[PDB]
A paper describes a structure:
Transcription initiation in bacteria involves the recruitment of RNAP by sigma factors (σ) to promoter regions located upstream from the transcription start site (TSS, position +1). In approximately 60% of bacteria, a major variant σ factor, σ54, forms a class of its own, lacking structural and sequence similarity to σ70. In σ54-mediated transcription initiation, σ54 recruits RNAP to genes responsible for regulating a variety of stress responses, including nutrient depletion, membrane stress, antibiotic exposure, and biofilm formation. In this study, we used single-particle cryo-electron microscopy (cryoEM) to determine the structures of initial transcribing complexes of increasing RNA lengths from 5 nt to 9 nt, which allow us to propose a mechanism of RNAP promoter escape in the σ54 system.
Using a combination of focused classification and electron density subtraction, we obtained several distinct structural states within the same dataset, including pre- and post-translocated RNA states, as well as σ-free states. We focused on the pre- and post-translocated states which were resolved to 2.8 and 3.4 Å resolution respectively based on gold standard Fourier Shell Correlation curves. We could resolve almost the entire RNAP (including one α-CTD), DNA between −29 and +20, 5 nt RNA as well as σ54 CBD, ELH-HTH, and RpoN domains. In the RPitc-5nt structures, we could resolve extra residues in RII, including 93–106 (Inset). In RPitc-5nt, residues 104–112 form the tip of a β-hairpin (Inset), and residues 93–103 emerge from the β subunit side of the RNAP instead (Left). We now refer to this β-hairpin (residues 104–112) as the RII-finger due to its functional similarity with the σ70 finger, also known as R3.2 in σ70. In RPitc-5nt, RII contacts the template strand at the −5 position, and threads around the template DNA–RNA hybrid and forms a sharp kink at P110 (Inset). The RII-finger is stabilized by hydrophobic interactions between P110 and Y112 of RII, and the conserved P251, V253, and P254 on the β′ lid and M330 on β′ switch 2 region (Inset). During initial transcription, as in RPitc-5nt, the template strand expands into the back of the cleft. The template strand now interacts with the σ54 RII-finger.
Residue numbers in the entry:
A (entry chain D): 348 to 932
B (entry chain E): 2 to 75
C (entry chain C): 1094 to 1341
D (entry chain D): 1230 to 1376
E (entry chain C): 548 to 944
F (entry chain A): 7 to 237, 248 to 324
G (entry chain B): 4 to 237
The structure:
RNA sequence: GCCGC
């Protein structure tokens, strides 16, 4: 009981801890609370009178309902709850309508989008449940993902596009080498149109440093930058360098600056910074007026020449085959290889044409810069799209075939800007159907695996502080042949050392033992040349019926070491099983 | 209104014990026989207890002692 | 404009027909606009017929041949009034209009060839920096509505077996708190929320009424008991040859 | 553990998924219970039994004078499906796979559950011995130990 | 559930359900036909020498595989000869270059591989096949609005779908329109064709608002005015979501492609108030409620306007029989039909006799089992359909 | 120190199209006056719209009329587009009767005292046989914005008979507004701007009057920023306690315990009220017996207790 | 009913320090928050009278890039410091002020010569730091009144570079407004739900008080409409 | 059968 459901829309005016609740759902989810408040205020003497008054929905009932919703958190949940981020707590905001308004920053964690998704609503009618919702399950509490530690609540899509557009440069724009006293003046000139975000100008800038122990030191230095970067600097909290905003902020700088703010400043500042970032990104993305036009998909001029040359190779190799000195396998493999080479060459030509498309004059002569093409900006910012999508849109669709796994000899030489033939579309339908059928079948195989993992791991709780064991596991970077994928810092961060770490200088020890390793310690050991670190693991806890809090490092959801009473088994099962729907089988 | 309880969490650091301590204090202020030790800003007893914890004048030990003193008074 | 659509939905979906349809709709509405303007000023039938003829025989060797010469003078007026809103273009599935044809139709309608125009913010009056694509698109309303998809329950009827609330709207049911939801609550460490979901407010027959009375009294204390589903399970297992009991 | 962590991470890293190695090692630990016995002297002889019970029993036997009583053991490796059906609680592992297979053995052996895990307390309807319910379960344990 | 190369001109490789039934439910291609034995066929144009002929043959999967079939989009001359020597063809489940003489058949049309529903997507070849699947599937969920609006951009298949579906009214033997009305059309058949004796005229009863299987509204409106000549096969009245005989299942919106302050984040759509004011995307929904009276052990169940223990306010909208007046606006739990069932009682207690003495003879012994509007249902009385048993008294309504 | 715009050169293209010029303007003020004027004129202009209809035979909208080519819904949608200009009234009734053949238009609406039909060739209906008539009563009201028929309920305060044909009211006579800023021809001044406003309406509101109304609205709204400055209810309770008709001994006991109102008493529990001297076990049930006939059990909980 | 519009009441002003204010007005009709906020911001950010430093004459090198005779601060930073100096000129269209300083120490605004018709709001404003040597600095700055913001695009005065060297092309900020921003939120009154709540945040150079700036901006905007509100006046 | 994955 005390449950609801409807379609979700977006609320961009919402704070991170807020959600928009239809006022018709409330007055039903909170009926006993309304009865109690009605009887307490003397409006209704009997429960029958309160029930009749609520049934008629008078205005005083709406006033009482607002007070009931004044300070009572609520839970929203999306139907395939792969992880605990599946349900999050919010403070309801009463709205006129029939759809739940959801904050855009939690959509990624919910895996939700506004094309028909619905959520359920639950009310915690208990002092203990209300506190648990406020202290454990609120959105402002769970910002880091408890699977890798990276921020799960991050800007995306229009926020990334707006921030990327704001922090860009143009070689010649309104304002050049202009000197400004304050970033607000740059914003004032920008509002007047005197200052251009693309235009690069010098403004007086100041910074605060946490290097003094628990103290920030002011540092005022005039710096080179653009108008948009100075305008965005007004949002950054104190204690962050100015070098964090003199960049494209391509959706990776934004996550990095959020992570640095969390690690240096705390949670309340990062929660605010994120809200401000989403607001300003939306506003400037709207102001930019970005649009997609048929002319943005630029086909390279040399595409037809490459196609014709490849056709010449196909004809000559077949003639070599007709002469009889080439077997079927040889010619088939060679044709596949040359078609792949031609596809790569045409894709490279397309990307080279589309990257620095803007050849722009300067104060003297002419220069070339990064293009302001809308599709290229979408791909470069990381807001949406990739190279493979753009390559298909403006370059060849490429070699593909999935009737049984083989490859059709002649590829699709047409993009989507040009039309496809009936034959090429029929060929692509095979891969389309294969992917769509794989999606609707692998889901079970993943859910069964998640069930088995949860059922095997549910009985694991941190029940000790420190077991004192000296056992551990050696940790080294993942080097495969000549290529490395995982540095030592990633595999070591947030772990407790089983043994002392010695530098190449003998006897000398950079770090102590049984010590959790954080960003400072990892940076210190990265300056030196340590390659192997012994860290204690849960497989050697030495504690029966549970693990110690020292053999398990810090929990990834909070930078501190994990506390007793945390169900680590369910966390591990959910974090392993949440992907798998995206694993290609 | 407190969006973030960090301060309250750090006052006695477990993220689990504080939820209980605040439930005990909120029961005291809600069922009866208790008045807030901080000004009341038209907010609910839950956040009142959380703010009292953040201000440093409420913890599990004081609840145990105040209870002992009031039991000895009767 | 009537609708505002996100450009970010196009490039990662490879929905290029959206943009081409928008451009061609802009061209069609431009031709209709020209015809409407001509009809407003009551221009003589000859030049209106001439413009309709010029618009109909445009393209690159299209099969459709239509001449207004064999058209009645009144029928020309009726046709012009019928296509006063816009010219209904038709592009067959794999054999249709090309970019150049769309561009020359745009030129005949006296519109920018790129399909992008200058737009102004309605709240501030400022011009947007980049040109924004504006045109006409065919939009549908599907059979999914919030009214047919908004449900909220506080307390209703319950199944005789398991003493648990019914499911689904049109029956005033409650939302199912499944296994993964319970896993998430366990992962959070929210024991009291889980106990209040698992016991009272679900299958505790006495706990439900006690909790309702406490909430009406403004107490907010769970006082949890034992679910009836576990009693049903005990009876079902005892109905086999197996004796199952609760020790003290 | 190194073989399992490296092998499973290869699948995930190839697709671009970041998962901390702690989570994989948590599930390997649950796979490393149920040690066998290759000795005797402590009422264990050639049988599959819990690792924790062996270490607890050995420590008690080694604590006393008869240190040689402690039995040498060989650790096993079970699958996640086979390890979850080998738990000492019959209420769980009957809610996961097939009840008839588990309920039949439990009836013959006459075992007890004692409700020490998360699944068992969820079914009964009690607070979990984790999170905010961890303290409540601890206080009850002292009362049982103290009578 | 995969696409087979023999699916070419028989089943469209786009239209299919998504989740559980993918690849198991298919649709016929627009030209496909079934063999007498029961095997799917598709038409091809014969090719003799280097010139295609307008004669058309239907070939099953084996028949098509045996011959080299050219592509629909291969250029031809005035005499019918291919402009380009080397042409693209399908020989045996594959495709490659062959000489024009090598080809034995030619694809009749490009659409030959597209379903009728997909045939309605303009610029389909610039859309992803899996994505197009979604568009074709979603095209069939659209609900007709208050007024039909033609597509500004189409494909030319709207007329065939509109007419062949039987939704419109088509002149079977059209002559000249004699009388027009919102509910009837009368046509005076031309004298050039007639059935001897009794002469004859054509009467069409246009369908007015009526419930559909999905509770939408099906309505027909005339397209002809008066004294209008009408030929055979012309459209007289169009049904739901049809405009002058063309399929019109949506509306033409003026759209800008830009981000607007986070209100179109993800797939959200920002709509102006002029769309709401102009009643575009407004639909009519029709619901059916029924009440039945059956004899009971207590006795017959009677339908009456008078109801025990009910105030005059609930009986304001009832007829003398006890039914809501046609055109009444009903909300909440208003009473539609007044029905009373008898109760069982044969021991007259003195209090019961007293109750019968002060109050009516029944003393409200008869229970109340009436048809009330379910909560959440606001409707206006549109049509009442009283049916009466043979022998029992006919209802006053 | 600023020049003030003047209303000069107001030219009217068509009956609906018009141009308004504000000749003298400073550097930036062109848009500040413009965009503000466009927003005010598109949002809040008064007008008159058809509110409800009463056709003879038709009682609802989903029916048809014999002899009439269009449905009732189409007739109502046609009437929604009828533009009128009433003077001195807000609830004129536009009677319309016409029997015969051909489209029925506003023209043949009965000539009211002070009601102007801006375009009389606006068709609303069609007749298809000689022996058919249409007769309807149309109510026109004055308003400001879009008021849907479903959203208004105060009209249901008095019961409306079966046969009403209400239609959504828009009340806004402005359809399109565009503005543009040019350079003023004044050569003595260094550089001045001129604002030109094009408004397309339904012929109901004058252009100059519309501009005056918008400017007046803007001035009244700005008047607030010119000088910002600024820097126990239920009737059964709160009733005399001598309304329960209690016994004699209760009167002194209630007076002794300072029980003078009804609400304060119902806040007394049994166990604590028994502690009062000489209350009496049987007399206590008498107190409860009387308060039970009112429906007021002892032990209630009010929040604030006023002196009255 | 008609011709009657909602008026804001119980408006809240939050004054921070002495140059920062936050004004909240509620309730407003739908769309009026954006109209009022945009008009007020535009006039405040573009058309407001005030006095500012526009020309600077330093004894020594008159080039834009100069050795600065070892004054420890680049001439660009000197012009930046004089750009932010705020003055209150009384009854003068223009006035020339000269400041000369000797001996190690920071040059503040109080070191300018005293003129009875010119007021300095921040005497602790720092112009140039000491050369670090017993050197002497002579400065000649003239403050003139104007409107809005006039960037130093070009001088176009006197002949050739005679005025540009004398002016040194200092950016002129006549308007006494540092920042002006507004936000429109959702407010509800009685049964109505779609109303505007306007929040204005403004900071000032210190010559004027935020509320006074709002009053002046609204006053000039209202006086601009007199030619249309005069006859049509209540 | 359909919708959201
Ligand atoms: Mg979705
Ligand atoms: Zn350990």
């Amino acid at each position: 009981d005390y449950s609801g459901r409807s379609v979700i829309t977006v609320g961009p005016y919402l704070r991170l801890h807020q959600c928009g609740l239809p006022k018709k759902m409330a007055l039903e989810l909170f009926k006993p609370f309304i009865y109690g408040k009605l009887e307490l205020r003397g409006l209704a003497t009997t429960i029958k009178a309160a029930k009749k008054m609520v049934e008629r929905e008078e205005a005083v009932v709406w006033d009482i309902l607002d007070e009931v919703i004044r300070e009572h958190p609520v839970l929203l949940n999306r139907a395939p709850t792969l992880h605990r981020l599946g349900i999050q707590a919010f403070e309801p905001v009463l709205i006129e309508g029939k759809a739940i308004q959801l904050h855009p920053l939690v959509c990624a964690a919910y895996n939700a989008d506004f094309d028909g998704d619905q959520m359920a609503v639950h009310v915690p009618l208990t002092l203990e449940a209300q506190l648990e919702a406020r202290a454990l399950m609120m959105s402002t509490n769970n910002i880091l993902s408890p699977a890798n530690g990276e921020p799960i609540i991050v800007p995306s899509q229009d926020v990334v596009l707006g921030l990327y557009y704001m922090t860009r440069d143009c070689v010649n724009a309104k304002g050049e080498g202009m000197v400004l006293t304050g970033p607000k003046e740059a914003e004032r000139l920008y509002r007047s149109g005197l200052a251009s975000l693309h235009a690069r100008v010098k403004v007086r800038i100041t910074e605060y440093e946490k290097d003094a122990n628990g103290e920030l030191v002011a540092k005022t230095s005039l710096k080179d930058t653009t108008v948009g970067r100075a305008i965005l600097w007004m949002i950054v909290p104190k204690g962050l360098p100015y070098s964090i905003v003199n960049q494209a902020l391509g959706k990776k700088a934004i996550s990095k600056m959020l992570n640095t703010c969390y690690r240096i400043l705390g949670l309340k500042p990062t929660v605010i910074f994120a809200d401000q970032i989403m607001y300003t990104g939306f506003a400037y993305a709207a102001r930019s007026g970005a649009s997609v036009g048929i002319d943005d998909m630029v086909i390279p001029e040399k595409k037809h020449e490459i196609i014709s040359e490849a056709e010449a190779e196909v004809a000559e190799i077949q003639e070599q085959f007709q002469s009889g000195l080439v077997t079927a396998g040889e010619r088939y493999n060679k044709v596949i290889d040359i078609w792949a080479a031609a596809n790569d060459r045409v894709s490279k030509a397309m990307m080279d044409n589309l990257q620095t498309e803007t050849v722009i004059n300067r104060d003297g002569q002419e220069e070339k810069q990064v293009s302001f093409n809308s599709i290229y900006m979408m791909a470069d910012s990381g807001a949406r799209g990739s190279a493979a999508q753009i390559r298909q849109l403006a370059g060849m669709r490429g070699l593909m075939a999935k009737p049984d796994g083989s490859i059709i000899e002649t590829p699709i030489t047409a993009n989507f800007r040009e039309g496809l033939n009936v034959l090429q579309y029929f060929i692509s339908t095979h891969g389309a159907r294969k992917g769509l059928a794989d999606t609707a079948l692998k889901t079970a195989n993943s859910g069964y695996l998640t069930r088995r993992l949860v059922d095997v791991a549910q009985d694991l709780v941190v029940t000790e502080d420190d077991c004192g064991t000296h056992e551990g596991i050696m940790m080294t970077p993942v080097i495969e042949g000549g290529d490395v994928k995982e540095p030592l810092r990633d595999r070591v961060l947030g772990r407790v050392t089983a043994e002392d770490v010695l530098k190449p200088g003998t006897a000398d020890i950079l770090v102590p033992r049984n010590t959790l390793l954080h960003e400072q310690w990892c940076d210190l050991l990265e300056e030196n040349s340590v390659d192997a670190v012994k860290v204690r693991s849960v497989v050697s806890c030495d504690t029966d019926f549970g693990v110690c809090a020292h053999c398990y490092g810090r929990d990834l959801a909070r930078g501190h070491i994990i506390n007793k009473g945390e169900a680590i088994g369910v966390i591990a099962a959910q974090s392993i099983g949440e992907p798998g729907t995206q694993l290609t089988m | 209104a407190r969006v973030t309880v960090q301060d309250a969490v750090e006052k006695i650091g477990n993220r689990f014990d504080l939820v209980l301590v605040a439930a005990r204090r909120a029961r005291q202020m809600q069922v009866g026989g208790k008045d807030p030790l901080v000004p009341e800003e038209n907010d609910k007893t839950t956040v009142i207890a959380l703010r009292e914890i953040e201000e440093g004048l409420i913890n599990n030990q004081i609840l145990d002692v105040r209870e002992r003193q009031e039991q000895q008074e009767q | 404009v009537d609708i505002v659509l996100n450009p970010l939905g196009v490039p990662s979906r490879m929905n290029i027909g959206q943009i081409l349809e928008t451009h061609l709709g802009m061209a069609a509405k431009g031709i209709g606009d020209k015809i409407n303007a001509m009809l407003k000023q009551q221009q003589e039938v000859a030049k209106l017929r001439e413009f309709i003829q010029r618009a109909y025989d445009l393209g690159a060797d299209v099969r459709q041949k239509v001449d207004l010469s064999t058209f009645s003078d009144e029928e020309v007026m009726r046709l012009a009034e019928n296509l006063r809103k816009g010219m209904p273009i038709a592009t067959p599935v794999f054999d249709g209009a090309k970019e150049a044809e769309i561009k020359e139709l745009l030129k005949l309608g006296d519109l920018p060839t790129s399909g992008q125009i200058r737009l102004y913010d309605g709240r501030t009056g400022e011009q947007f920096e980049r040109p924004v694509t504006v045109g006409y698109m065919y939009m549908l309303k599907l059979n999914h509505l919030v009214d047919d998809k908004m449900h909220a329950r506080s307390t209703g009827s319950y199944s005789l077996v398991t003493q648990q609330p019914l499911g689904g709207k049109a029956q005033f049911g409650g939302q199912r708190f499944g296994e993964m939801e319970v896993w998430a609550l366990e992962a959070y460490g929210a024991a009291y929320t889980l106990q209040e979901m698992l016991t009272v407010k679900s299958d505790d027959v006495n706990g439900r009424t006690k909790m309702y009375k406490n909430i009406v009294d403004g107490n907010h204390q769970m006082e949890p008991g034992m679910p009836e589903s576990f009693n049903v399970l005990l009876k079902e297992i005892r109905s086999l040859g197996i004796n199952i009991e609760l020790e003290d | 553990t190194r073989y399992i962590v490296n092998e499973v991470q290869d699948v995930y890293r190839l697709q671009g998924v970041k998962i901390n190695d702690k989570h994989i090692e948590v599930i390997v630990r649950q796979m490393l219970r149920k040690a066998t016995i290759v000795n005797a002297g402590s009422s264990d002889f050639l049988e599959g039994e819990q690792v924790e019970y062996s270490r607890v029993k050995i420590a008690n036997r080694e604590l006393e004078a008869n240190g040689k009583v402690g039995a040498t053991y060989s650790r096993d490796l079970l699958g996640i499906t086979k390890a979850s059906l080998a738990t000492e609680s019959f209420i769980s592992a009957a809610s996961f796979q097939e009840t008839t297979r588990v309920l039949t053995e439990a009836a013959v052996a006459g075992k007890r559950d004692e409700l020490r895990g998360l699944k068992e307390n969820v079914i009964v309807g009690r607070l979990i011995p984790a999170g905010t319910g961890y303290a409540y379960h601890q206080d009850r344990m002292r009362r049982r130990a103290a009578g | 559930r995969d696409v087979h190369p023999t699916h070419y001109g028989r089943v469209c490789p786009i239209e299919t359900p998504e989740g559980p039934n993918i690849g198991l439910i298919n649709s016929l291609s627009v030209y496909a036909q079934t063999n007498e034995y029961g095997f799917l066929e598709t038409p091809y144009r014969k090719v003799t020498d280097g010139v295609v002929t307008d004669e058309i043959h239907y070939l099953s999967a084996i028949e098509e595989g045996n011959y080299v079939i050219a592509q629909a989009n291969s250029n031809l001359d005035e005499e019918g000869h291919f402009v380009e020597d080397l042409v693209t063809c399908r020989s045996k489940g594959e495709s490659s270059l062959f000489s024009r003489d090598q080809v034995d058949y030619m694809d009749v049309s490009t659409q030959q591989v597209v379903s009728v529903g997909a045939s309605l997507i303009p610029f389909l070849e610039h859309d992803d096949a899996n994505r197009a699947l979604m568009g074709a599937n979603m095209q069939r969920q659209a609900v007709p609005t208050l007024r039909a609006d033609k597509p500004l951009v189409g494909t030319g298949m709207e007329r065939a779908v509109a007419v062949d579906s039987g939704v419109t009214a088509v002149a079977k033997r059209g002559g000249v329109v004699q009388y027009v009305d919102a509910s009837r059309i009368v046509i005076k058949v031309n004298e050039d064709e007639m059935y001897p004796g009794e002469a004859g005229i054509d009467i069409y009863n246009l369908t007015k608002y009526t419930r559909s299987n999905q509770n939408t509204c099906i309505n027909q409106m005339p397209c002809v005015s008066l004294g209008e000549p009408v030929e055979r096969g012309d459209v007289l009245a169009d049904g739901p979501s049809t405009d002058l005989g063309e399929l019109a299942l949506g509306q033409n919106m003026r759209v800008a492609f830009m981000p607007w302050n986070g209100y179109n984040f993800e797939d959200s759509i920002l709509v102006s108030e002029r769309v709401v004011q102009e009643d575009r995307f407004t639909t009519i929904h029709i619901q059916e409620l029924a009440c039945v009276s059956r004899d009971t052990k207590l006795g017959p169940e009677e339908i009456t306007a008078d109801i025990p223990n009910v105030g005059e306010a609930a009986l304001s909208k009832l007829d003398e029989s006890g039914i809501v007046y046609i055109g009444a606006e009903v909300t909440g739990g208003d009473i539609l039909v007044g029905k009373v069932t008898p109760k069982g009682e044969t021991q007259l207690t003195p209090e019961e006799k007293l109750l019968r003495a002060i109050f009516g003879e029944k003393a409200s012994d008869v229970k109340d089992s009436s048809l009330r509007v379910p909560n959440g249902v606001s409707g206006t009385v549109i049509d009442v359909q009283v049916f009466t048993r043979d022998g029992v008294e006919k209802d006053k309504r | 120190e600023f020049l003030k715009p003047r209303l000069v050169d107001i030219e009217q293209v068509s009956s609906t199209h018009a141009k308004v010029t504000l000749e003298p303007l400073e550097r930036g003020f062109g848009h500040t006056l413009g965009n503000a004027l466009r927003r005010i004129l598109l949002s809040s202009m008064p007008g008159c719209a058809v509110t409800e209809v009463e056709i003879d035979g038709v009682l609802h909208e989903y029916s048809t009329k014999e002899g009439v080519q269009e449905d009732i819904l189409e007739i109502l949608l046609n009437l929604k587009g009828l533009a009128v200009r009433v003077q001195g009234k807000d609830e004129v009734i536009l009677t319309l009767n016409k029997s015969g053949i051909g489209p029925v238009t506003a023209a043949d609406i009965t000539h009211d005292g002070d009601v102007e039909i801006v375009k009389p060739q606006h068709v609303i209906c069609h007749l298809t046989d000689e022996n058919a008539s249409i007769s309807m009563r149309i109510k026109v009201q004055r308003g400001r914005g879009y008021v849907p028929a479903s959203t208004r309920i105060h009209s249901e305060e008095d019961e409306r008979p079966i046969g009403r044909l209400l239609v959504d009211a828009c009340y806004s006579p402005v359809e399109r507004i565009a503005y543009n800023v040019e350079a003023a021809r004044v050569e003595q001044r260094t550089d001045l701007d001129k604002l030109v406003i094009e408004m397309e309406t339904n012929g109901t509101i004058d252009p100059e009057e519309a501009i005056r109304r918008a400017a007046t609205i803007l001035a009244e709204q700005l008047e607030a920023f010119v000088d910002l400055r600024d820097v126990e209810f239920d009737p059964i309770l709160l009733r005399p306690v001598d309304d329960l008709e209690l016994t004699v001994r209760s009167a002194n006991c209630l007076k002794a315990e300072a029980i003078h109102y009804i609400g304060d008493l119902v806040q007394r529990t049994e166990v604590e009220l028994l502690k009062t001297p000489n209350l009496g076990k049987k007399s206590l049930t008498e107190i409860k017996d009387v308060l039970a006939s009112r429906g007021l059990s002892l032990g209630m909980r009010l929040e604030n207790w006023p002196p009255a």
